Write an enzyme that holds these catalytic residues in place. Sequence first.
Site, PDB file in Angstrom:
ATOM      1  N   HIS A   1       0.828  -1.200   0.000  1.00 21.26           N
ATOM      2  CA  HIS A   1       0.000   0.000   0.000  1.00 21.26           C
ATOM      3  C   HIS A   1       0.866   1.256   0.000  1.00 21.26           C
ATOM      4  CE1 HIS A   1      -3.058   2.723   2.301  1.00 21.26           C
ATOM      5  NE2 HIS A   1      -2.913   3.084   1.038  1.00 21.26           N
TER       6      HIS A   1
ATOM      7  N   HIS B   1       1.329   5.403  -1.667  1.00 20.49           N
ATOM      8  CA  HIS B   1       1.829   6.660  -1.112  1.00 20.49           C
ATOM      9  C   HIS B   1       3.138   7.132  -1.746  1.00 20.49           C
ATOM     10  CE1 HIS B   1      -1.034   5.369   1.976  1.00 20.49           C
ATOM     11  NE2 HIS B   1      -1.104   6.639   2.329  1.00 20.49           N
TER      12      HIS B   1
ATOM     13  N   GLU C   1      -5.745   9.382   0.575  1.00 18.68           N
ATOM     14  CA  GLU C   1      -6.003   7.965   0.374  1.00 18.68           C
ATOM     15  C   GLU C   1      -6.853   7.723  -0.870  1.00 18.68           C
ATOM     16  OE1 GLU C   1      -4.214   6.343   2.511  1.00 18.68           O
ATOM     17  OE2 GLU C   1      -4.553   4.552   1.293  1.00 18.68           O
TER      18      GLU C   1
ATOM     19  N   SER D   1      -3.459   1.479  -5.059  1.00 20.27           N
ATOM     20  CA  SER D   1      -2.995   0.233  -4.467  1.00 20.27           C
ATOM     21  C   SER D   1      -4.010  -0.896  -4.548  1.00 20.27           C
ATOM     22  CB  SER D   1      -2.603   0.447  -2.996  1.00 20.27           C
ATOM     23  OG  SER D   1      -2.382  -0.792  -2.343  1.00 20.27           O
TER      24      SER D   1
HETATM   25  C1  LIG Z   1      -5.234  10.093   8.980  1.00 22.87           C
HETATM   26  C2  LIG Z   1      -6.293   9.006   9.122  1.00 22.87           C
HETATM   27  O1  LIG Z   1      -6.594   8.812  10.508  1.00 22.87           O
HETATM   28  C3  LIG Z   1      -5.811   7.694   8.517  1.00 22.87           C
HETATM   29  O2  LIG Z   1      -6.801   6.681   8.728  1.00 22.87           O
HETATM   30  C4  LIG Z   1      -4.493   7.254   9.146  1.00 22.87           C
HETATM   31  C5  LIG Z   1      -4.739   6.444  10.418  1.00 22.87           C
HETATM   32  N1  LIG Z   1      -3.495   5.905  10.936  1.00 22.87           N
HETATM   33  C6  LIG Z   1      -2.587   5.406  10.072  1.00 22.87           C
HETATM   34  N2  LIG Z   1      -1.563   4.628  10.480  1.00 22.87           N
HETATM   35  C7  LIG Z   1      -0.658   4.132   9.597  1.00 22.87           C
HETATM   36  N3  LIG Z   1       0.349   3.357  10.065  1.00 22.87           N
HETATM   37  N4  LIG Z   1      -0.720   4.380   8.276  1.00 22.87           N
HETATM   38  C8  LIG Z   1      -1.684   5.136   7.736  1.00 22.87           C
HETATM   39  O3  LIG Z   1      -1.717   5.349   6.505  1.00 22.87           O
HETATM   40  C9  LIG Z   1      -2.709   5.712   8.634  1.00 22.87           C
HETATM   41  N5  LIG Z   1      -3.719   6.487   8.187  1.00 22.87           N
END
Ligand SMILES: C[C@H](O)[C@H](O)[C@H]1CNc2nc(N)[nH]c(=O)c2N1
Lengths: 423, 423, 423, 423
Positions: free
Chosen positions: A258, A263, A303, A322
């Site tokens: 992903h 990203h 996202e 992804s």
């Molecule tokens: C910003 C939003 O809360 C999003 O769901 C975040 C949550 N925590 C995360 N934690 C990780 N490790 N990676 C991510 O891409 C995200 N995205």
Amino acid sequence: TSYIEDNCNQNGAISLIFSLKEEVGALAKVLRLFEENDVNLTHIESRPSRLKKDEYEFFTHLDKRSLPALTNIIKILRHDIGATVHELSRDKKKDTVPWFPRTIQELDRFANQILDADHPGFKDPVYRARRKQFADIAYNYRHGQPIPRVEYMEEEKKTWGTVFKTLKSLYKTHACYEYNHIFPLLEKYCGFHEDNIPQLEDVSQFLQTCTGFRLRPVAGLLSSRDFLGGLAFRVFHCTQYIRHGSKPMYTPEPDICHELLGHVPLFSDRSFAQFSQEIGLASLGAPDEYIEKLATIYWFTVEFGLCKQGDSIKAYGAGLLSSFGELQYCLSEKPKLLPLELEKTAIQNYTVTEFQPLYYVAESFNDAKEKVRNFAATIPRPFSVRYDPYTQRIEVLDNTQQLKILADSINSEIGILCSALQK
Amino acid sequence: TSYIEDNCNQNGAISLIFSLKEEVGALAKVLRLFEENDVNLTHIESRPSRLKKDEYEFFTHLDKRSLPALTNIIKILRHDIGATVHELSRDKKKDTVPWFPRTIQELDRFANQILDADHPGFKDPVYRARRKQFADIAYNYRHGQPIPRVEYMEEEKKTWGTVFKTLKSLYKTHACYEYNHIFPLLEKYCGFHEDNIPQLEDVSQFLQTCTGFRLRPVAGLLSSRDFLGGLAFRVFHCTQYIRHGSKPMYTPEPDICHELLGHVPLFSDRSFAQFSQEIGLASLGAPDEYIEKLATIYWFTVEFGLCKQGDSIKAYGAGLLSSFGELQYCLSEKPKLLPLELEKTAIQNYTVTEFQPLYYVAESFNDAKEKVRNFAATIPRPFSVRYDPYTQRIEVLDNTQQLKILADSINSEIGILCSALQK
Amino acid sequence: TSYIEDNCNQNGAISLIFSLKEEVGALAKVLRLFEENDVNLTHIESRPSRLKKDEYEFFTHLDKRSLPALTNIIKILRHDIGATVHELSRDKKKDTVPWFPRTIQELDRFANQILDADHPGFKDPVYRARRKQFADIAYNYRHGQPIPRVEYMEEEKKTWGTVFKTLKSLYKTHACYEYNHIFPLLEKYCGFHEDNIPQLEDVSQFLQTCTGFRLRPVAGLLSSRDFLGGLAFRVFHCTQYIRHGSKPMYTPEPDICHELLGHVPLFSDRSFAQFSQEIGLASLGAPDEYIEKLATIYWFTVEFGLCKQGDSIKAYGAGLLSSFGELQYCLSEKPKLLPLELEKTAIQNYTVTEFQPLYYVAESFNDAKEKVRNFAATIPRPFSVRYDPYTQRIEVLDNTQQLKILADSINSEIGILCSALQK
Amino acid sequence: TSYIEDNCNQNGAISLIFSLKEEVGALAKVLRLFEENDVNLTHIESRPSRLKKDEYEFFTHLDKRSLPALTNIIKILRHDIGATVHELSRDKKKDTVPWFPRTIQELDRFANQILDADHPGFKDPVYRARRKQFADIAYNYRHGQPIPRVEYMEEEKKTWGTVFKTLKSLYKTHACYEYNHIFPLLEKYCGFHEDNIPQLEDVSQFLQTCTGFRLRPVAGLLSSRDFLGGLAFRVFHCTQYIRHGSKPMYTPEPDICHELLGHVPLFSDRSFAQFSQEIGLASLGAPDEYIEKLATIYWFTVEFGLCKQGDSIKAYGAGLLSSFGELQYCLSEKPKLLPLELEKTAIQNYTVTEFQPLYYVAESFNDAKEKVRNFAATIPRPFSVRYDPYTQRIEVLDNTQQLKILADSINSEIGILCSALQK
Ligand SMILES: C[C@H](O)[C@H](O)[C@H]1CNc2nc(N)[nH]c(=O)c2N1
Ligand SMILES: C[C@H](O)[C@H](O)[C@H]1CNc2nc(N)[nH]c(=O)c2N1
Ligand SMILES: C[C@H](O)[C@H](O)[C@H]1CNc2nc(N)[nH]c(=O)c2N1
Ligand SMILES: C[C@H](O)[C@H](O)[C@H]1CNc2nc(N)[nH]c(=O)c2N1
């Protein structure tokens, strides 16, 4: 939603934001005041105020174990001396600004605070034995270090192989320009083959070679405040694990692919990097409510975002680029597309698993940056924020400090541009 | 004078700075060009244009082994593709820009390009062996690494003690405020006391927390060009060796005491950092012709300058604040005072080991920055420069991009300013 | 010196410059305030804030008949509504900004505020009656009207002829290019020949087609303050009378030949217009204290300046190019030359009818503009100014609006520039 | 559509855009070349080039009567001398840029080139006898004059009375903010009662008191090029006639009320004024096709636009705010509302009589300004345009001239802002 409510440790984190003018007694006053109260002076760091030549800024590296006297110190600080103190608390107690890391090195305190049976490969003891190992790697990393590199098993290698086989062949007509631009470079430079797994460190360093963006090994999904706050520092927390060989195209929680295919390649573009970063910067010290709102934005943009592109509309979402199926869905005529607007985009509810019914399209990342800064002007915090690229600490700015620093910075830019006028 | 002309290495340094706009074959053409002619890709790294989304930028880390093949590559780049090529050469031959580093890491390439019987302690084997030790330390140090901490003998400890005893008691009225403020910090933080020597690493950390300025252990003295380029990167090449116990107020070659007590405390103010750095940038691509003048500036400004300070005239020179006698000689009716103006300040002969007859006075460091930048706009080099703090690479700018980058950056700054206006 | 202190009229001039933000009652409160206290609305005009959409700006055209009622109005504006009021007074009493016009039309208010036996032709009734004729013409002229064209006698025609015969043949090497270029135009276009006098109207039209600068027939000499304010509006107060035939190279009071041959041709270059105008703006709201210095500047710059011009030093002074002897005296080794710097240029005593011992040299008019503006940033006045070319009203700016207006204007300019960059 | 194809006069207008560098023979060369070919030299006006000190700009005040030699002159000009000439032709002949007025005074050549039995009041000889009289007034007006004032009959007075009775009561909740802001002022100042008809001149002068916008009496509806070109000069052409007393709420062709209640009050806002003006500026020298596209834009924006307003959407259309029925329709839920986009807005077809089904909403006028300038970057003309507020002539800019003028203008803005930084 993708909002995850945030937690705390029992020790905690009580920081005190304050600057101090070189007044009679001052620098002796503060540090003696602290060492009388048992506070370690490796934890009371003072540096100069980068604005008022006669002032310093003070960082208090503390926790709630200093509480038996932390009242008193604050008592003397705000009212007996007259220093403007803002307390950062992670417990979010009585009207206390929510805690956040203040330097790029303070990220290690709460970076391991992440993460059901239905996980794909659950009754496989091999995948779990591997998953605690990868979480361990994130557990033992401290800032500054290179990311410890792991030899990946081969079944996982062909899971990546298959996902890549699909997504690569499908990116050339689905991904945004800035993705087809970066990706050949990643291929030839970092080891982004369909037949090879890159190590987190090399990608980190490449992203620093493009934009100063860094990859930090995180065991799982962190709370929104910590995730978006780390993104403020141009630091993207990323996972080291793969999906199961049984089902290579579904993961409830993000995996290696992903990040490397959703990203990272966009994190190699400065325009997109600054875009994400400004949101990051805005996330800190923000109300939990506005962290729900930030999570919503991140979801529908980073996202799952789209971008107007002269002739086309293309996907810049990290879940779009992804997930093979939703990358088909996205430009199909099924889903909804409207010019992105944060007044609604925040008040936009969504689903976690199901293909997101409606999408939001930007013009270019920079316009979205403008919009983010605009919405940042709405988050209620009794101070401003702005990130220092060299010191890698967030300048907490008050009324008077915003002024001289932006004034002279723009003056320097003005000088260089005025010289650009002379050909 | 203290001006030092630059030399070359057996390998050399041949870079080809060029960007290329993303057409079909363009980047294919170049990467084809190198491995068609067998050139190694451990050194040919291509990354995106941080400015024009549709372009790549090329940093080619080459040497004179490409001389057996560079003709063809240059030709195809200039005429078959149509790329504006500027070749960086340290041999500085026909049509060659004088070489300088593009990365914060290219400073290790020419860090060993440095350095007498009349020295007090010449045939003293202990001081000799210790100077070879410190030369070794600087010989094997590469950027990013921690500066190794060194255990000092006692004679060296109290030589420092004496120098400090004298100069400290005096600074309260001779040094600029930006020194009288910072030094209280350095004393209690890094170990800037009369009975203890700070290790370069600790001071470096302090200085990056203040200004992103860094301490680099260097053997003897590096060519003016190289010294000032490293200062362009906000990296200070610095000495780790001490003077001999025989003559505690005479050292022909700059030592630990000179660096830590003359240079550093002023390197702890951002405004001064910007001043020195702007000079640094002006040094890059500059011909030796105007680099003689640059060295002169540094001498009469950083090392031996005076500054208007509200009511008085005060010394911010690093040589003024490090040589006890001349700090008093300078603050008397003996010496001559001239308002800093580069028409004369550059054009002025001087000697090194001399109570300086005349001095130059600035208003504030910021205005001095402006004057340096203005005069820099006069040196003829076929491009301008400005440094990227995150990536730690200097954006080499041509005509077309300078405007779009600063224009849009200032667009953002003025937007946030216009919204801050309403309180 | 030629500095003239300012006076007042029997009516006076009381303006109250204030803007007000659109709340319910605010503008109702003020317009209520005037007619509740009976003040006439032939003079109380309120228009919108050209900047803050939600505010009005107030220009109050008043006089000392409001003294029987101004107390109450001021009080209610300052404390019952909360409006930042700056009162403009020509009586210049306690807490009074020194009066100056806000409209291009308020220049007629104090256009008659001007003006000896030793004059050659004092008891000559013909020259006397003609000077009363021209004083009448200037007495009844109001802005916007066409400048009445006047039939000259023959003695006046050939007095002009002689002055021109001498100075013209000489200009080819003494005047700045901006004069040597413009004069060929004026000759054949407006009638700047040796046998014909142009009428102010025609020259005015020429000068507005070049620079928006305008010719205003004025009786004798107007206070320094008023003269320089009219020049702020890009309006030149000018003379229509000629000198006596007895002494064709001596005139104590500036005449047609002095204006049309010293001032105008330089008023035909935009850069010079901006220079003089910026000075003008600096004159507004300035105390008599620094207006002595301003008059000095005008003398040593506009009237008696020299300018670096690529290879040589050349005269752009309007008095240099109008008094034949001093144009040669100045270009010789006799006089002294000092680089224009306002620290000294303002602070320097002089005499009027004197071969000037020392002169001041500029680089180009634009840099002189910068120096004037810089020194203007030093005069203490409780607001800055900048002129609106379309409305022909000077935007009087406080703290809050200056930034939003210039920031956004430059936002537009840099946008068009960024798009022009791609060819 | 509202596009009206443009016409010509038999004499025509052949202008020659060219600047000239002071070369050997030059200024004599040109004017003699013209007077040899019978061209009047009251019609060959030359002024200096406001950019390159050594160049002039040349305006040729001609027509097709000079054709028997106009070939030859052009022959010598472009190819024998080497001056870049662009010919303006109103006949739109062989690949000739379409003619437009070049100064604010050239508008009188083609201002009377305007205008079925079904007109309301047609068989009333009284309304037609009045309509030719009002057309006459527009026929005899020349630039600079005050608008000759007419005593309006009373039946027309109560036609205005009724329309005003409706629209006033309905504006407070329908009109954009900037309308409810200006309108009370117009009421109290110009004579904007429901019981009184204002004279064109007073409104003109008021609009110049706010924004330098001017009212020019035009007999009827001009061709799109002339209308939008006049709007470039901050000059709005307006009608002096009223509707018939039989049907006071329908006019096929705009009347006095449409301007006084649809256009003018918004023309008193600088933001909206510049908005309209930039379109104006862009209209000149544009292809007829892009004049159809401009007409479309003007219609859906100026005549029928909406504006996002924080909480509400409001109407800024001039036909919206003048037609009672469609002002009801507009904010009703019937019609279509989407964020304005010119990519489609131009390719948006519409109806002349029928209530426009769909509407387009802006954020603020300035964003629309940005968008207009953007689309202006699309109109194909072999030169740029930019309006001079003082000289009231359109600067025709080439490659090299755009550069120095924007450079230094922004430098001046930069200086004043950099001084605003020092508080
Ligand atoms: C910003 C939003 O809360 C999003 O769901 C975040 C949550 N925590 C995360 N934690 C990780 N490790 N990676 C991510 O891409 C995200 N995205
Ligand atoms: C900058 C000026 O050229 C000056 O002489 C430089 C020369 N090279 C140097 N080299 C070292 N190692 N240390 C210094 O302080 C200097 N100073
Ligand atoms: C500007 C300076 O004060 C200078 O003496 C002024 C004074 N007032 C004047 N008044 C008139 N009518 N004409 C002038 O040239 C001057 N010059
Ligand atoms: C710009 C567009 O062509 C629009 O229909 C124009 C046409 N000509 C005009 N003519 C006049 N007199 N008044 C107007 O408002 C217009 N509008």
